[PDB]
C-alpha cells in the first residue's frame, strides 16, 4: 500500500518522474496515418507510464486493461493540449509536428475536433495551468474514467473501486496542496479545483467525438494496421 502514504509533494514528484518521453513524429489518409502512427507509439509509453501511477499496479490486470482502454484517447488529448498550451492557435503533436487549425481540414470532420482541442488549450493557458497540476489531472483521468465501468458483481471488484477512490482522494489533497503553496485562498482553491475537474468533462467529450471519428476513419480503410492502436480502438 505505497500509494496512500505518499505526501502531496511525494505524489507530485513521483508523477513528474513517470512522465513519458516526448516522441518525434515520422491528403486525408496520410494525415490520419501521421496522427495514428504517433498515437500508437505513445500508447506503448503510456502503458509504461500507467504502471508508474500510484495505486495502478495494485489493481488486477483485467482492471488495468480496463482503465487504459477507457481513458487512453483522453490521455493523449490532455497531453497534446498541455504541450500546445504555449502555442496559441497551434497543436503541438510532437516537436517536429506543429499543426495549424486550418491543417485540420485535410481530414473530414477533424477540424471540428482540432477546434475543441485548441479551445481546451486556450482555457488551460488562460488559467495558467501548472505542470504539477497537469500530471495530477492526467492520473485522475486514468483512474476515474473506467472506475464506473467496472464489473460491479464481485466483492473483489468492489474493493478495487474503493481503493481507486482512496487514491483519487489523495490526488485531490495533492491538488489542494499545490494551490495553497501557490498562495490561493481556501475559496480560490476549491474554485480552481472544480474549474479543472469540470474540464476533464469536456475532455471526456472531445474523446468521445474523436473515438467516433477514428472508428469512422477506420471504416473508410484509411487507418494503417497499427496493432496496439486498433486494440484500444476495438474495446468500444
Amino acid at each position: 500500500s505505497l500509494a496512500l502514504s505518499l505526501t502531496a509533494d511525494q505524489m507530485v514528484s513521483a508523477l513528474l518522474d513517470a512522465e513519458p518521453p516526448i516522441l518525434y513524429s515520422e491528403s486525408e489518409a496520410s494525415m490520419m496515418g501521421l496522427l495514428t502512427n504517433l498515437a500508437d507509439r505513445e500508447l506503448v509509453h503510456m502503458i509504461n507510464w500507467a504502471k508508474r501511477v500510484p495505486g495502478f499496479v495494485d489493481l488486477t490486470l483485467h482492471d488495468q486493461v480496463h482503465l487504459l482502454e477507457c481513458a487512453w484517447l483522453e490521455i493523449l488529448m490532455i497531453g497534446l493540449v498541455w504541450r500546445s498550451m504555449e502555442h496559441p492557435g497551434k497543436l503541438l503533436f510532437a516537436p517536429n509536428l506543429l499543426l495549424d487549425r486550418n491543417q485540420g481540414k485535410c481530414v473530414e470532420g477533424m477540424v471540428e475536433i482540432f477546434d475543441m482541442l485548441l479551445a481546451t488549450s486556450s482555457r488551460f493557458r488562460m488559467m495558467n495551468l501548472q505542470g504539477e497540476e497537469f500530471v495530477c489531472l492526467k492520473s485522475i483521468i486514468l483512474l476515474n474514467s473506467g472506475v464506473y465501468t467496472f464489473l460491479s458483481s464481485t466483492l473483489k471488484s468492489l474493493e478495487e473501486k474503493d481503493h481507486i477512490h482512496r487514491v483519487l482522494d489523495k490526488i485531490t489533497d495533492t491538488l489542494i496542496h499545490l494551490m495553497a503553496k501557490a498562495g490561493l485562498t481556501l475559496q480560490q482553491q476549491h474554485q480552481r479545483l472544480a474549474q479543472l475537474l469540470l474540464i476533464l468533462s469536456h475532455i471526456r467529450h472531445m474523446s468521445n467525438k474523436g473515438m467516433e471519428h477514428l472508428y469512422s476513419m477506420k471504416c473508410k480503410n484509411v487507418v494503417p494496421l497499427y496493432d496496439l492502436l486498433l486494440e484500444m480502438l476495438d474495446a468500444h
Binding site: 506503448v44 502503458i47 509504461n48 500507467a50 504502471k51 490486470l61 488495468q64 486493461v65 487504459l68 482502454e69 496493432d227 496496439l228 486494440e231 484500444m232
Partner: peptide
C-alpha cells in the same frame, strides 16, 4: 487475449 495485456504484465 493481448499487446496491451503483454506490456502491462
Amino acid at each position: 487475449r493481448x499487446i496491451l495485456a503483454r506490456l502491462l504484465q
